[PDB]
RNA sequence: UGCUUGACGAUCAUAGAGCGUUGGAACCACCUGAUCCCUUCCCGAACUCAGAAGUGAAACGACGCAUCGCCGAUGGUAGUGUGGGGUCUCCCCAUGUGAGAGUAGGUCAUCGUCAAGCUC
RNA sequence: AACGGAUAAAAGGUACUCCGGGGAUAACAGGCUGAUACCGCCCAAGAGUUCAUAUCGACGGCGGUGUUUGGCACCUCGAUGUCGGCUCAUCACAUCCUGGGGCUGAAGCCGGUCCCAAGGGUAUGGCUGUUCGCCAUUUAAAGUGGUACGCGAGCUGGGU
RNA sequence: CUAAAGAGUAACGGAGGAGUACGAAGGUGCGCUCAGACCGGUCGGAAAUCGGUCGCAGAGUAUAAAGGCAAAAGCGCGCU
RNA sequence: UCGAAAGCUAUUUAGGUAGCGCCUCAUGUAUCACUCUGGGGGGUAGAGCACUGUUUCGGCUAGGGGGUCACUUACCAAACCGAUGCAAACUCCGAAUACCCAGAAGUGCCGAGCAUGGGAGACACACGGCGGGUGCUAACGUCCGUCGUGAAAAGGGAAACAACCCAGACCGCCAGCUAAGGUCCCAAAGUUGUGGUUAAGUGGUAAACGAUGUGGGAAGGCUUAGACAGCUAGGAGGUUGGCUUAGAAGCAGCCACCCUUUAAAGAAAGCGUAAUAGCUCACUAGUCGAGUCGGCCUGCGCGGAAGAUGUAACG
């Protein structure tokens, strides 16, 4: 599970989303790519059911990227407590997703096998996402 | 095989450029380089779309035609739809037989299905690196360059300094000092 | 453990701009270090205060080796 | 008439760094010695004094070179004031504005006062 | 230091209570919301002798309802009676029986699951104030909810 | 920090400190420049003191953070 | 006739009060606002990685750990190099606006500004937009900034509907023009004109996801040397592949999956046997005679879609 291990600051301000993702949207590294096409939220359970989903499809052989990382961490308030007195402590962390991000790389495998194995993975995210080959600039 | 036709282009800023890409599908573009001053000008995105399909749009000189004046230039960068993908942008630079360009030229990594390490070894290709940068004459500019594996074990790593420049081309990261990592075979992912 | 503490806001900043005419004795800047440096004209205070010490009109100027912001008072 | 050297400035990297070549007539530096002035929490290293045997090695100055650094458009993009709209966590249209990054490229500074020497 | 420091000098109880006020502010019910709850779906590693989807289904994802625990404090403090029982109900369908079907890891008998269907029907006792629950014995079945957790100007008063 | 590039700006919002210290740790004149790394060197070792190169403020500034700091505002000495 | 406030600061204060803010009146006095031009500072949006943290790959290499027990590295890893992301309490950068100042035209309803004084009220605010904290970027939630409205504002529209849209009612008129919003009937005004789309009453409530619904566009593959579909016929050996197995012999389990035969048949998908198996996918021959196949971008639709008194999610 993916976790910054250890940080300047327990918590942080919720902030808001609303980049189009000029920056981490290109396919370094690999050759095929699932890019997110929406905007939204990635849990670092989601990345990681997603990682799972996509590296036993391509079972035997193959190189992998996770190009997000959950930095962000999110408090919750538990059950039966009121507004006010605090923050409430982090629950989990999250990745900030706008459209064109490339959430994850392949390469090594057929792009046949690379599409099987990215649209395992984008059931398991909350965004839409769009299959993308790497491209000459 | 490159041929691609522009249109002198004079309402600029941020709405002229919105409504060349909204309402009629243009391609705002500038070219400069060369002796000249900079030109703005205009392309179809169906048109552009399609030379950019062949692998060497980007490593070949193309012939642009500003509204019947043609002119030899290269396609040094591109601004795409981070979400969509498609062209918004282009930036031709003007191709001159005397001065020296630099160019990002495609890899082609041969005898990948014969290489030590692949059969003998049973190891991975795993392209690092693709897209050297060259710093050539127009005349030298190749289309590609290959990394001819071949004889490559498990361990080996294809550095920079293990291409070979076709006709008097310089890989521009090699001169500075950086020994890029081409390729390298590696244990098979389990 | 816990938080809700902070101090009073200490009206820090530039008092009078570029080309206002001043007074001698004239705050024109309150600041913490010296994020602006004294020019002609222009004195330091304990705080870093800078004051005007002639009568004139505010001058910004960044120069010098340093890269410093300067606080003059020209006629 | 201009150049060279030195001191003080303007400016503060397009001016810097690195590498290489060069200057000793003068200037400057290294240099000689330390009784004298003065100095070392020890040491003539530095500071200081009296000099001119030696040398441009170091430093400094000048000249060259884009290796680094620094500068850097045009176009586009992002953002954004106002008015309006939508599918309204976020966007779009009209109009005004408009980066940062990056790209093409640029740079081995420019100027002033005074003194000495030389040149013409 | 309750740091613009009431006095030099000061803690508690009230179900024995009382006054002035407040829906400016809690408890009930209503409302908004839907974290939670319940219901459904998407992907499908896997279980199922083999076989993902007969039946299930991890890791994750998307909804619906208003339905539990909550959040808020909008109505009511010049008073909107509470839990349970009794009597009498009315509606929904996410159906417990009966009716019609598809698939089945459906031989038959009996089942499992899903679709359609709301016409009618849908226990009696022991214990407990209980709703519930456990137990006994039936039944074709002993449905799940809404109705001021339906119903005290209809009854009860065991609980509170 | 929130705080929306003048000031100001709330929450039982997110983080830390104070209720001192110093007759020198103040004034002035004079002089100096850190941290760290590498190499060489008796005990001596990762790290003590010494020499050299790099280093150019990554140190220091009584104390929390922020802003400053070469005329150093950092360090030493004499007289006060 | 004018016309607020529900703010700041303090308060045994919090639903009270006090000074300041905002209203009014009077007196005095000369400023003020809008815009243009010019002069300023900034560290926000955005961006970035130069610092501080935090990422992910790769290369090179300390150092750590193995085999020696003096040499070499199974295995982790500092630094550096390159690529690559994030940040309210990061910044090498950096707007728009806003704010401060100066000069200038016109307009101020005859004044805006300021000063002094008489009289207050008010210090429970609410919603909507935008920027934020908090909450679940839940609440007609809560707390700030900023603007608009209500408060204290009627009229018209939004069915009804403080806070939304248009517009600010001195009085009268059985005059006219417009705003928002509308024009088949209720109910004033086009059953107007032109060109398309939809068939779902979508319009007139919803997601992931699913689908030969349908319109447009740009490409691609095969194709009168016969494309796609349909129909007929064929679809072989060593060999029962080494091995394993009660029996694997084409498919259960590891590995191989090569070669010839031919217009073609991979050591055989699924219904599935105790192994041969019955059917049969790839492939070909004939017939057939003109299109055919599935991907992309996109407009409008479809399913997903269950609630309680009565149709009841166009009034
Ligand atoms: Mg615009
Ligand atoms: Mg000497
Ligand atoms: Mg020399
Ligand atoms: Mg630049
Ligand atoms: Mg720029
Ligand atoms: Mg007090
Ligand atoms: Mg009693
Ligand atoms: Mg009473
Ligand atoms: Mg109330
Ligand atoms: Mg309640
Ligand atoms: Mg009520
Ligand atoms: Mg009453
Ligand atoms: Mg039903
Ligand atoms: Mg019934
Ligand atoms: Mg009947
Ligand atoms: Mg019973
Ligand atoms: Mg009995
Ligand atoms: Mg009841
Ligand atoms: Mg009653
Ligand atoms: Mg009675
Ligand atoms: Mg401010
Ligand atoms: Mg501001
Ligand atoms: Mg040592
Ligand atoms: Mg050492
Ligand atoms: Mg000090
Ligand atoms: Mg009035
Ligand atoms: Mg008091
Ligand atoms: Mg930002
Ligand atoms: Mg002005
Ligand atoms: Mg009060
Ligand atoms: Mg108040
Ligand atoms: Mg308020
Ligand atoms: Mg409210
Ligand atoms: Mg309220
Ligand atoms: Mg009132
Ligand atoms: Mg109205
Ligand atoms: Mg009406
Ligand atoms: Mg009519
Ligand atoms: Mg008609
Ligand atoms: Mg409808
Ligand atoms: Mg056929
Ligand atoms: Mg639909």
Redesign the pocket.
């Known amino acids: 599970?993916?976790?910054?291990?250890?940080?300047?600051?327990?918590?942080?301000?919720?902030?808001?989303?609303?980049?189009?993702?000029?920056?981490?949207?290109?396919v370094?590294?690999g050759e095929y790519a699932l890019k997110a096409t929406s905007?939204?939220?990635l849990?670092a359970?989601?990345?990681?059911?997603?990682r799972?989903?996509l590296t036993?499809?391509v079972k035997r052989g193959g190189?992998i990227?996770?190009?997000?990382?959950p930095?962000?961490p999110?408090?919750?308030?538990?059950?039966?407590?009121?507004?006010?007195?605090?923050?409430?402590?982090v629950e989990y962390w999250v990745?900030?997703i706008?459209?064109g991000?490339?959430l994850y790389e392949i390469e090594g495998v057929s792009e046949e096998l690379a599409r099987e194995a990215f649209?395992?993975a984008?059931?398991?995210?909350?965004?839409?996402?769009?299959f993308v080959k790497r491209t000459v600039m | 095989d490159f041929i691609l036709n522009a249109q002198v282009?004079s309402?600029?800023?941020?709405?002229?450029?919105?409504?060349?890409?909204?309402?009629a599908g243009l391609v705002?573009?500038?070219?400069?380089?060369?002796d000249k001053?900079?030109?703005?000008?205009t392309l179809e995105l169906?048109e552009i779309?399609?030379l950019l399909?062949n692998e060497a749009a980007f490593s070949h000189v193309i012939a642009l035609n500003v509204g019947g004046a043609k002119e030899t230039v290269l396609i040094?960068?591109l601004?795409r739809h981070?979400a969509?993908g498609f062209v918004?942008?282009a930036?031709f630079?003007?191709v001159v037989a005397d001065?020296?360009?630099?160019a990002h030229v495609p890899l082609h990594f041969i005898n990948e299905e014969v290489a030590v390490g692949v059969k003998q070894a049973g190891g991975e290709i795993?392209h690092?690196?693709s897209e050297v940068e060259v710093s050539c004459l127009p005349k030298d500019l190749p289309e590609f360059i290959e990394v001819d594996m071949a004889k490559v074990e498990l361990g080996q790593?294809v550095?920079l300094s293990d291409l070979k420049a076709p006709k008097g081309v310089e890989l521009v990261?090699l001169?500075?000092?950086?020994?890029?990592?081409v390729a390298?075979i590696?244990?098979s992912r389990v | 453990?816990?938080?809700?503490?902070?101090?009073?806001?200490?009206?820090?900043?530039?008092?009078?701009?570029?080309?206002?005419?001043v007074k001698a004795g004239n705050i024109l800047?309150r600041?913490?270090?010296?994020?602006?440096?004294?020019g002609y004209g222009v004195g330091?205070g304990k705080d870093?205060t800078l004051f005007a010490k002639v009568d004139g009109?505010?001058?910004?100027?960044?120069?010098?080796?340093?890269?410093?912001?300067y606080v003059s008072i020209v006629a």
């Open positions: 599970m993916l976790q910054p291990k250890r940080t300047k600051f327990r918590k942080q301000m919720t902030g808001h989303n609303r980049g189009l993702a000029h920056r981490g949207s290109k370094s590294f905007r939204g939220r849990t359970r989601q990345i990681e059911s997603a799972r989903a036993r499809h190189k990227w996770i190009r997000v990382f930095d962000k999110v408090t919750k308030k538990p059950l039966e407590v009121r507004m006010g007195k605090g923050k409430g402590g990745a900030q706008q459209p991000k490339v649209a395992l984008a059931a398991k995210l909350p965004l839409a996402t769009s | 282009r309402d600029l800023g941020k709405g002229a450029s919105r409504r060349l890409r909204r309402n705002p573009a500038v070219v400069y380089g060369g001053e900079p030109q703005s000008v169906r779309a399609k399909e040094k960068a601004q981070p969509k918004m942008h930036d630079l003007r001065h020296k360009l630099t795993s690092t690196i790593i550095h990261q001169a500075h000092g950086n020994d890029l990592a390298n590696h244990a | 453990t816990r938080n809700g503490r902070d101090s009073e806001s200490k009206r820090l900043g530039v008092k009078l701009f570029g080309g206002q005419a800047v600041q913490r270090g010296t994020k602006f440096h004294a330091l870093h009109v505010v001058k910004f100027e960044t120069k010098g080796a340093f890269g410093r912001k």
